[PDB]
Amino acid sequence: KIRTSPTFRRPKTLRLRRQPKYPRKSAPRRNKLDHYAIIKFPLTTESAMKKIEDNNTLVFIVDVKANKHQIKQAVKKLYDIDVAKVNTLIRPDGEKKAYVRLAPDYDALDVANKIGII
């Protein structure tokens, strides 16, 4: 019953966690940004061609919401390939362009043929 401090501090009180009687939302929101929304369409420009032929990297236009982890995960099991690196930029028209460099064993030219880029 001894107070060894000249200061009175608010006692620590129990704080219960929420146990709602009803969820405020009936159902979880559907993930709008899925693998198909992440990848919009591959870029098929001369510069993108050089990237496919030389750097073994594919060029995609992707959702601006998506990040490198999502882009890598989307490309990985959309086209059933492995991805080594993802470099993203936002082009002046507001789109996000992703340079997706595949693993060395995968061939970008082969994958471009299956996609339909060339």
């Binding site: 001894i2 107070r3 060894t4 401090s5 000249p6 200061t7 009175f8």
Partner: protein, 239 residues
């Protein structure tokens, strides 16, 4: 005994070893609400409390109040669940024979200042018990005087919460006895005689008994030290 053990006393002098963890309860910076209720208790002692409010400081002593509650326990108001039992039982049992048996409603305590005030005015209250800690005190500050005027004995008791427990509520400003059973008539009479001498018969001096007007311990101590100095002077004059 191990020779390695030795005393290591600490010198708690000024400039010496760090002071111990002493009890600082006296010097704690309490919250505003704790300071407010404490300073209010002091203002009641410091200020001149008029006799109408001050008379509630005179409460029944411990053994009388315990005796009073012992009798009042026998006349506690029925709980709503207890009343429901009484009813179903009365309705079903009286259905078998003759339903029309009003008989007599047994005696019971009457609670609430409004119920008691009317009972006193009609002289139907044999004994009125008022809590001493009613706030606002206006609710009962007239009640001791009113009981005196109608000649009904009244006693002030410690704790509105104590009265509230009789009537199964949190608090109760006052309770009143109107009727008691045959065996409790003697027990009630002894209490009424003791209470009447304490409160009703003494009400002339209660009306003028001002309270408070007591200075705090430090100021009174300075006053006593000055009085000792004045006494030293009186002793020198005698010499």
């Amino acid at each position: 005994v191990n020779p390695l053990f030795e005393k290591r006393p600490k010198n708690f002098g000024i400039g010496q070893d760090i002071q111990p963890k002493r009890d600082l309860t006296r010097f704690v910076k309490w919250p505003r609400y704790i300071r407010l209720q404490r300073q209010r208790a002091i203002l009641y002692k410091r200020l001149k409390v008029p006799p109408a409010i001050n008379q509630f400081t005179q409460a029944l002593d411990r053994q009388t109040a315990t005796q009073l509650l012992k009798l009042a326990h026998k006349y506690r108001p029925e709980t709503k669940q207890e009343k429901k039992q009484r009813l179903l039982a009365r309705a079903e049992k009286k259905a078998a024979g003759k339903g029309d048996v009003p008989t007599k409603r047994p005696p019971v305590l009457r609670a609430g200042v409004n119920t008691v005030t009317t009972l006193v005015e009609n002289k139907k209250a044999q004994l009125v018990v008022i809590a001493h800690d009613v706030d606002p005190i206006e609710l009962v500050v007239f009640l001791p005087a009113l009981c005196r005027k109608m000649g009904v004995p009244y006693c002030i008791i410690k704790g509105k919460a104590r009265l509230g427990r009789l009537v199964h509520r949190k608090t109760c400003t006052t309770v009143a006895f109107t009727q008691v059973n045959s065996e409790d008539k003697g027990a009630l009479a002894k209490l009424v005689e003791a209470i009447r001498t304490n409160y009703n018969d003494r009400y002339d001096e209660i009306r003028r008994h001002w309270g408070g007007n007591v200075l705090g311990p430090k100021s009174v101590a300075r006053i006593a030290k000055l009085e000792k100095a004045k006494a030293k002077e009186l002793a020198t004059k005698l010499g």
